[PDB]
Amino acid sequence: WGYGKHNGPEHWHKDFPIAKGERQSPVDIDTHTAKYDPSLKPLSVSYDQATSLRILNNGHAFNVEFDDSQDKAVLKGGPLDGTYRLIQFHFHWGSLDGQGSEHTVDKKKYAAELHLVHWNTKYGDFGKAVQQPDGLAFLGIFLKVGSAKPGLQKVVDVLDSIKTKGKSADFTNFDPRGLLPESLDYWTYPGSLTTPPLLECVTWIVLKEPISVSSEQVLKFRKLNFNGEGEPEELMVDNWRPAQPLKNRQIKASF
Ligand SMILES: [Hg+2]
Numbered sequence: 001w002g003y004g005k006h007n008g009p010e011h012w013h014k015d016f017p018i019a020k021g022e023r024q025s026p027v028d029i030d031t032h033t034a035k036y037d038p039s040l041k042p043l044s045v046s047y048d049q050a051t052s053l054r055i056l057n058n059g060h061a062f063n064v065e066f067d068d069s070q071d072k073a074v075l076k077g078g079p080l081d082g083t084y085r086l087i088q089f090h091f092h093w094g095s096l097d098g099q100g101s102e103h104t105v106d107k108k109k110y111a112a113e114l115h116l117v118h119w120n121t122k123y124g125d126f127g128k129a130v131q132q133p134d135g136l137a138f139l140g141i142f143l144k145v146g147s148a149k150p151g152l153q154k155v156v157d158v159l160d161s162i163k164t165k166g167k168s169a170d171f172t173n174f175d176p177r178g179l180l181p182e183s184l185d186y187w188t189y190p191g192s193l194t195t196p197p198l199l200e201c202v203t204w205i206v207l208k209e210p211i212s213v214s215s216e217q218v219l220k221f222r223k224l225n226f227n228g229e230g231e232p233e234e235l236m237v238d239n240w241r242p243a244q245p246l247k248n249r250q251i252k253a254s255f
């Protein structure tokens with residue numbers, strides 16, 4: 001599986017039949033059909049204690065890994081019941097500035113999309129979490145090209161070191177708080193992972209307000225390789241999956 005013509009998203013159903021399921025992500029967020037829900041509580045992001053460990057290029061993106069052996073960085077409140085631990089964050093970007101995001105807003109696509117992955121601490125590990133309907137909680141942040149994001153520079157600078165698939169680098173004392181928008185207004189609906197295995201174990205929390213990043217910050221993303229070292233270079237671009245059918249599901253707004 002990849003994002004190429006021959007192993008692309010249109011082919012995932014073959015190896016992963018859930019690709020055609022009832023609660024697949026991403027989806028188009030129709031802001032006029034979204035249901036404002038008052039009973040929705042405010043999001044609770046406690047990342048003060050976050051412990052970043054390393055960064056790795058897994059051939060389809062780069063992951064910043066956190067120590068989830070304890071409740072250091074958690075997510076609670078909103079639509080969620082119980083606490084979710086941060087395990088990793090990664091992005092989805094485009095070849096050009098007019099594409100890259102997975103989720104769209106009134107059909108509008110952003111340059112990138114940030115996903116902070118959390119697992120329900122009542123299931124004990126990530127492994128078991130992927131076996132439950134309420135196992136995961138994904139925090140989605142849209143990215144747009146504008147002014148630089150100071151808090152992303154650290155990441156941007158480490159990329160040189162993990163250019164090819166399989167590479168990794170120590171990446172400690174990285175604070176995710178610096179990737180958060182001003183507002184915490186959000187859309188929420190029941191979805192899935194946007195990459196194989198595409199498990200329908202996720203509660204999606206997409207923030208309304210996007211973070212802005214400089215063109216030169218996005219450029220460094222586009223310098224990455226899908227390929228391993230010593231193989232023909234295939235730039236890591238367009239690593240996003242097209243919007244899926246909502247299929248009777250209802251998208252709710254906290255605003
Ligand atoms: Hg599941």
Ligand SMILES: [Zn+2]
Pocket residue numbers: 090091092115194
């Ligand atoms: Zn993702």
